[PDB]
Amino acid sequence: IVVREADCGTTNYISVPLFQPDEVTRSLRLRKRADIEAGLYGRVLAREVEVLGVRLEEGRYLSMDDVHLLIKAAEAGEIQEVPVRSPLTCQTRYGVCQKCYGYDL
């Protein structure tokens, strides 16, 4: 597996959950500031999301500052999932692309 690309054109994406079904039977709650971070830090937005006032555009890499906004938004109740590129859905057979990997070099 190696990053060798051009933005892989296949946009099939994963949606990262901000809520979990069962610590206590059923009660929706905001995931931890950590796990959520793990899921969306420096990722590439598959589709555009308008949340608290700002228009996170498509393909934008979300900084930790941005993944700090989305939670602040899920706190308010504006989003329950997040559209985002990922290696699980890449088209580059042997390899992964810039937009699907993300930030973290």
Q: Which residues are annotated as a binding site?
A: 8, 90, 97, 100
Which residues of this chain interact with Zn ion, rule CB under 5 A? 8, 90, 97, 100
Cβ of residue 51: shortest distance to Zn ion, in angstroms? 24
CB-based burial label for 84 (10 Å; 0-12, 13-18, 19+): buried
Select 6 or 34, whichever has its Cβ closest to Zn ion: 6
Select 43 or 71, whichever has its Cβ closest to Zn ion: 43
Nearest to 71 by CA among 103, 97, 35, 101: 35
Query: Alpha-carbon distance 30 to 77, whole Å?
Result: 10
Select 71 or 100, whichever has its Cβ closest to Zn ion: 100
In eight-state DSSP terms, residue 3 is B
Annotated binding site for Zn(2+): 8, 90, 97, 100
